[PDB]
Amino acid sequence: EVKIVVDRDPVKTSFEEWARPGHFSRTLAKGPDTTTWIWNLHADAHDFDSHTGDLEEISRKVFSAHFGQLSIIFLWLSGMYFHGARFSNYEAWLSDPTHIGPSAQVVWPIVGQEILNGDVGGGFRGIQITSGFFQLWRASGI
């Protein structure tokens, strides 16, 4: 039938392999023959198919890998909402959305690069964004 049989503790959480670069592959693990080695390390990092020969482990790796990809997106989303809250003229934009540019990035003035802080209006300055989050945050009644 359809059930949930899983395993318990397949691979033990440890830091050993973090100090043995190229542990995953039998060929890469012997060490850096030449600089060709440090290119093959990344070219075969994610090729789970070449590391092992059975579908079970390949599955568990892609399943867990996706969680990493899912996690980064959330972190990417978190910044966008944070940045729109601490460094934006959003609330000003909600007053005259027709003629105030959406700005949600502000640069530190080190080497003159504060010229990048444009007069996007609304009593604010900064890089005028174009990803169009502001229309998304208004359509959700923020």
């Binding site: 850096p32 023959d33 030449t34 600089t35 060709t36 080695w37 440090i38 290119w39 070219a43 540019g101 005028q128 174009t130």
Partner: protein, 75 residues
Amino acid sequence: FVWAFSLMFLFSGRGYWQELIESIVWAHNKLKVAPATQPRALSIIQGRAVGVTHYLLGGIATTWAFFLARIIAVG
């Protein structure tokens, strides 16, 4: 610059870059600074892979800067 840069990888081949590497390697033997991860030129399918990657990056970014600056100023 990045777009024009990629052409160096697509047009040329590895066997030339391997040899020029050798002469550079010799000078380091003279001063004892020859590394132990022996220098090598990129593998054949890597010369292409780097070649296409830059070409795409130069082409797409050029349009990127072309579009945003144009449209932001006119509306």
